[model samples]
Target: MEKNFVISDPRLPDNPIIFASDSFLELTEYSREEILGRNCRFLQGPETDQATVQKIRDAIRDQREITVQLINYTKSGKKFWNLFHLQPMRDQKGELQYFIGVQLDGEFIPNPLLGL
Candidate 1:
């Protein structure tokens, strides 16, 4: 269950990132100051597939959960494969509060899911 988590503020334009976990900070190589208020797309690079990005966008727009593989880059410009999961979190009032993103880097091991 050790995964990167990000809390996004949907009230803001483009649902900017409000908080990120230490795990995420380590993965992106970004200081809290540098990552806060920015969208996750900051990790996207020229080589990142547009189709994959679109799929994620569509899922978010529809408020649906989705899991996909993403080609993401670190702050230092290192490419990695991320098994990304995006889910919506709601408040007690059942109001949409944030989009929680969980990710596992493929480069770290054979597979995060299998732990192999």
Candidate 2:
């Protein structure tokens, strides 16, 4: 595969909305199109619990990089544990433009065994 695939496609908004990998598709049951222009929180459902969501919101506001294990729902309403790692990206002016997140299967699967 190419090193990069445009998020939402070039025809959509020029914002960063990329996922860590196509494997995420399995967890979300959403094709790239469905997720673009939407907050990652859309994955959160009734079972996600507000406390965790609030914590994530606070972390983003504080601009602190963090990785979290969260309960995320798929389009089909299936819930799964997802490990999310987020890092902020800045423009040349040093203003935060977007965050890059790596969504990992959060079942404590060994990273090395999963080929990193």
Candidate 3:
């Protein structure tokens, strides 16, 4: 499956993005050069959940993994719900210097659970 992902620098001031996958670009309708070196907050908007935002904020500060389904906007100002997963990657010295974020489009979120 084609994966949408972004690698961000945690040690940098404000934890700006360093790299974004092609799938991510297509998903967000943003060019690589436009996304690189920018904070993820640019994707957020007025209707985004404050509680979910706080959860992700705490996880980033604590250097932990978290999953949140948040509403994000595209470059054309179109809204899309992103099932976002953010996790820290360990370097050789185990420093919390990088984070990997993947996004799953919410358009396909509703499906059969087959709950027993």
Q: In order, how many clashes per candidate?
A: 0, 0, 0
Worst 10 residues of 1 by lDDT: 107-116
Assess candidate 3 and give its TM-score to the true structure.
0.89
In candidate 3, what are the lDDT values of residues 17-110, reduced to their tens digit?
A: 9999999999999999999999988999987877889999999888999987888999999999898999999888987768999999884554
Q: After superposition, how far is residue 67 of candidate 3 from its true place, in Å?
A: 0.6
- Report how far off residue 68 is in candidate 1 (Å): 0.7
Winner of 1 and 2 under TM-score: 1
lDDT of each: 0.87, 0.63, 0.88
Most accurate candidate by TM-score: 3
List residue ranges in candidate 2 displaced over 4 A.
1-20, 109-116
Runs in model 1 lying further than 4 Å from the true structure? 107-116
Best-to-worst TM-score order: 3, 1, 2
Residue pairs clashing, model 2: none
**How many clashes would you count in candidate 3?**
0
Superior candidate under TM-score, 1 versus 3 = 3
Clash list (residue pairs), candidate 1: none
**Highest-lDDT candidate:** 3
TM per candidate comes to: 0.88, 0.71, 0.89
In candidate 2, what are the lDDT values of residues 1-116, reduced to their tens digit?
32221222212344336553466665578887787676667778876657657867777677677876677888988877777676766779977766677776555645354333
> Which of the two, 2 or 3, has more TM-score?
3
